[PDB]
Design a binder for this molecule. Sequence first.
Ligand SMILES: CC(C)[C@@H]1NC(=O)CCCCOc2ccc(cc2)C[C@@H](C(=O)O)NC1=O
Ligand SMILES: CC(C)[C@@H]1NC(=O)CCCCOc2ccc(cc2)C[C@@H](C(=O)O)NC1=O
Lengths: 99, 99
Amino acid sequence: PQITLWKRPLVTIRIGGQLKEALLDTGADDTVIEEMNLPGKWKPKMIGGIGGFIKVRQYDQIPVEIAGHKAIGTVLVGPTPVNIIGRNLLTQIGATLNF
Amino acid sequence: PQITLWKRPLVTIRIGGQLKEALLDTGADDTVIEEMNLPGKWKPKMIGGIGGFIKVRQYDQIPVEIAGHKAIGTVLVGPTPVNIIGRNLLTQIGATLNF
Ligand SMILES: CC(C)[C@@H]1NC(=O)CCCCOc2ccc(cc2)C[C@@H](C(=O)O)NC1=O
Ligand SMILES: CC(C)[C@@H]1NC(=O)CCCCOc2ccc(cc2)C[C@@H](C(=O)O)NC1=O
């Protein structure tokens, strides 16, 4: 689809079998999802944002369906204001910026 | 143009008479520019994201050219690690997400 930006580009995703709302974020290198239980082993990691650094749980090779498009990659779980789909998964679904 | 997301979508912008590199960020409501001695009246503001909040100076009706496309609006100036072009200006240049 083509999504304009008058509002936050929020879309529904399925991860770990559960539905969640997430923001398509071209300003994010990584995908960061609010605290939740995800299958598999995770590794402690730290990532930075506009306000500083946070500790996250790094899960690798996680399937995430974004607005009907499939991606399988790294998902960081931790204290984020809103769920963020970053470039690692946006590239997988063939998302581009256009103007 | 079309910008892929394999790498950070950095483009050249012109603001306050200076050329800078900035990130086209669909996950940002506002535009935040690295500390620069911009003239004009401003209002105090706090913006948040991953890691927490930072204090910025809010300037209104500031002309900002983005890869040749003219825009004008609110620009927040503060200790951001990267210049960020947010939705307030992305809509002005007709930018969309597509997949
Ligand atoms: C969501 C983070 C994993 C991402 N943070 C990253 O992509 C890692 C680099 C963080 C420091 O540099 C920044 C780069 C970009 C931004 C802020 C800071 C914009 C901001 C956003 O989503 O709007 N991006 C981030 O906070
Ligand atoms: C790049 C920042 C301005 C930030 N945008 C970001 O930090 C990128 C997304 C981080 C997680 O999602 C958000 C977190 C916080 C917000 C919006 C989104 C609130 C909103 C604000 O304070 O006005 N912050 C942003 O849009």
